[PDB]
Every structure is written in C-alpha cells, then in structure tokens.
C-alpha cells in the first residue's frame, strides 16, 4: 500500500495473507468470507504470461495477522487449502475481466478478536454504496512504493471514480465487472494498492446497518500511485452469482 498508514489491531480481521511455501514469501492478499472460504484475485493463482499457476499444496493462508514477517504466535492461524476455484471466464489473456477466485480451507478456522469474516454485498448494497466519490478501504502488506516493505498491515481509504474517468485513464478495455478508485491529480490526497496487495479486499462500511462489505478485490493497475492512474478492482457483487454457485456446490 503506497501512501497509507499502519492498521490498528483488529481493524481488518477478515484480512488474509496468501503465503508461498517455498520460497517463503508474500504472494497476495485475500479475505475471509466464512469459516471455510477465502476470496482472492484469480491472477494471484493463475497468470500464464508470467508462468504463474499455483496448486493447492504450494501456498498457505495466514489469518489474523498484523505484522508482515513475524510468526504471530497465539494470534494468527495458518490454514491449508483443500481446493482452489478460479472463475471459468477469467480473462487472463486480455484485461483480467472476472479476476476472482475462491479457496476452500481444509478445516474451518476459529473466529477470534483478530479473525472474523467480512460481508458480501447484495444488489441493494451495491446500488447504495458503489457511487462515484464514495470511499472504500484497501489493506495489505504489499510494497510501500512502486520502486520498501511494511512492518505491519497498511490501510488507505480511496474514493470510487466515475467510469468515464477510469476509462479515459488507460488503454486497457474496462468492463462492467471492474471499477476504479483513487484520487485525481487535482485532489491533493494520494494512495494506492501495490505489489503484494493484490487479491486483497476493498471494503465499505454500510451507513444503514454498520457492517463492513467487500465491494472489490484489488485486481490491477499500471504502476502504483501514479498521477492520473487509478487502481482497478473486481466488482464483487457482479460476480456473486458465481460465488454462490461455487459455495452451494462445494
């Protein structure tokens, strides 16, 4: 996270670290959506142009963390993967359309002060909250700059951007399954996700019921925190029918 701040303890208890087994390293962010299911970006798991194709046995999920590098004894929980499910129409060839994946954990994780699932939006949630200028929150242990690494989880709040502005910022084809967020050059505030943060959650606190909802997944960008560029996020509600289908089936 570039131009963010340290998270408070228990601020993002749904935050998940995807951790490569060998070499030991941060792969991506993710989120906890139930005792048994974690949500992330498909590109965290499958991106053939860079020869990325993880199997279940290649990574671990670390839940309840604050420190990036420490083993947070008696606090974090380490979980193994039972199965990975990538959206079947994820478009890794072109523009990362439908950049979403689910992971089922081998065993259910116990909730605690530090570990608690985020809500997924329904249609009404999305309509109310996905509006230009409304701010959401992005968290992660990724790089602090485009070109180092944080001691603890970072957070930044960022406004949703008007679709034409998003479309005009990039040569990449934007779809309805994406939204963008970030400050404009003229706004004076800064902030973005970066390498290490992808797959993590973009969340909003509903002012109607005071619950946190995962509205996006950190999907892609061009550089990090560049003027006139915006981060792109997978639109979770637009893909909820697929999420439900997977959870219902498996």
């Amino acid at each position: 996270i570039v131009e963010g701040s340290d998270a408070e303890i228990g601020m993002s208890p749904w935050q998940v670290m995807l951790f490569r087994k060998s070499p030991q390293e941060l792969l991506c962010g993710a989120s906890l959506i139930s005792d048994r299911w974690v949500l992330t970006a498909a590109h965290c798991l499958l991106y053939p142009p860079w020869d990325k194709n993880f199997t279940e046995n290649d990574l671990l999920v670390r839940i309840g963390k604050h420190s990036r590098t420490r083993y947070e004894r008696n606090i974090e929980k380490i979980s193994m993967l039972e199965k990975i499910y990538i959206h079947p129409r994820y478009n890794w060839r072109e523009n990362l359309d439908r950049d979403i994946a689910l992971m089922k954990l081998k065993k259910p994780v116990a909730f605690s002060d530090y570990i608690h699932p985020v809500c997924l939006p329904d249609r009404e949630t999305a309509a109310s909250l996905l509006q230009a200028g409304y701010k959401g929150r992005v968290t992660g242990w990724g790089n602090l700059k485009e070109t180092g690494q944080p001691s603890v989880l970072q957070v930044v709040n960022l406004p949703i951007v008007e679709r034409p502005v998003c479309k005009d910022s990039t040569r990449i084809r934007i779809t309805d399954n994406m939204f963008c967020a970030g400050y404009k050059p003229d706004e004076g505030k800064r902030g973005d996700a970066c390498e290490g943060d992808s797959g993590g959650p973009f969340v909003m606190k509903s002012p109607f019921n005071n619950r946190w909802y995962q509205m996006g997944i950190v999907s892609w960008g061009e550089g990090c925190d560049r003027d006139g560029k915006y981060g792109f996020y997978t639109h979770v509600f637009r893909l909820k029918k697929w999420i439900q289908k997977v959870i219902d089936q498996f």
Binding site: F19, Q24, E25, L60, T69, R70, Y71, I78
Partner: peptide
C-alpha cells in the same frame, strides 16, 4: 519471514 511451526 520468521519460520512457521
């Protein structure tokens, strides 16, 4: 990263 048990 610190080693994990």
């Amino acid at each position: 990263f610190e080693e994990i048990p």
